[PDB]
């Protein structure tokens, strides 16, 4: 019963996460960051050098490991974390809901997947991911306004 942020790259998870940890004085984890740093490659180079399924295995395992932590944390999560059957039960999740249009400018990158530098593939991924964010959301948050306006809605779910 972590506070888990989800949704697509550039919807503002890590920044919300660093703000929520501060406001709530909880520790903040970032799954992409933890993997990149255990592996010693950017997430880009993980994809390039090691392939998506191996990244996806590093995500599956980290989810389980995060589940064993005692104290609640604020966790931001990579774009595809929802691909994982084992997210459910990590924590209370908050979907940072964005439209593709707003999203674009901000998702110019590093932890960015090579497919996310193809915009039509990006849009197709985005579309296919909508249903997965919704299915894995404890709460859905209109992320279109600022960091504050997302913060507002988060906190009311306590
Ligand atoms: O949406 C995804 O599958 C990606 C999102 C990023 O947060 C990084 O997890 C990684 O680039 C892959």
From Swiss-Prot:
Entry's Gene Ontology cellular component terms: cytosol
Pfam families to which the protein is assigned, alphabetical: SKI
Residues binding ATP, per UniProt: 10-15, 113
Co-factor remark: Binds 1 Mg(2+) ion per subunit.
InterPro entries: P-loop_NTPase, Shikimate/glucono_kinase, Shikimate_kinase/TSH1, Shikimate_kinase_CS
Cofactor(s) needed by this chain: Mg(2+)
One GO MF term: magnesium ion binding
Subcellular location: Cytoplasm
Region (LID domain) location: 108-120
Pathway participation: Metabolic intermediate biosynthesis; chorismate biosynthesis; chorismate from D-erythrose 4-phosphate and phosphoenolpyruvate: step 5/7
A single GO BP: amino acid biosynthetic process
Binding positions (Mg(2+)): 14
Reactions that this protein is recorded to catalyse: shikimate + ATP = 3-phosphoshikimate + ADP + H(+)
Binding, substrate: 32, 56, 79, 129
E.C. code: 2.7.1.71
Swiss-Prot/TrEMBL keywords: Amino-acid biosynthesis, Aromatic amino acid biosynthesis, ATP-binding, Cytoplasm, Kinase, Magnesium, Metal-binding, Nucleotide-binding, Transferase
Summary of the function given for this chain in its UniProt record: Catalyzes the specific phosphorylation of the 3-hydroxyl group of shikimic acid using ATP as a cosubstrate.
Assembly and binders: Monomer.
Family, similarity comment: Belongs to the shikimate kinase family.
Name of this protein: Shikimate kinase
Organism annotation: Helicobacter pylori (strain ATCC 700392 / 26695) (Campylobacter pylori)
Phylogenetic placement of the source organism: Bacteria, Pseudomonadati, Campylobacterota, Epsilonproteobacteria, Campylobacterales
Gene name of this polypeptide: aroK
């Amino acid at each position: 019963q972590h506070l888990v942020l989800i949704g697509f790259m550039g919807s503002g998870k890590s920044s919300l996460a660093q703000e929520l940890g501060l406001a709530l004085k909880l520790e903040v984890l970032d799954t992409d960051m933890i993997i990149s740093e255990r592996v010693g490659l950017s997430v880009r180079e993980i994809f390039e050098e090691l392939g998506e399924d191996n990244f996806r295995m590093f995500e599956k395992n980290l989810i389980d490991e995060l589940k064993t932590l005692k104290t609640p944390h604020v966790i931001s999560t990579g774009g595809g974390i929802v691909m994982h059957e084992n997210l459910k039960g990590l924590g209370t999740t908050f979907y940072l809901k964005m439209d593709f249009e707003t999203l674009i400018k901000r998702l110019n990158q590093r932890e960015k997947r090579p497919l996310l530098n193809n915009l039509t593939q990006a849009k197709e991924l985005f579309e296919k991911r909508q249903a997965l964010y919704e299915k894995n959301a404890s709460f859905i948050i209109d992320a279109r306004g600022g960091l504050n306006n997302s913060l507002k809605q988060v906190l009311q779910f306590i």
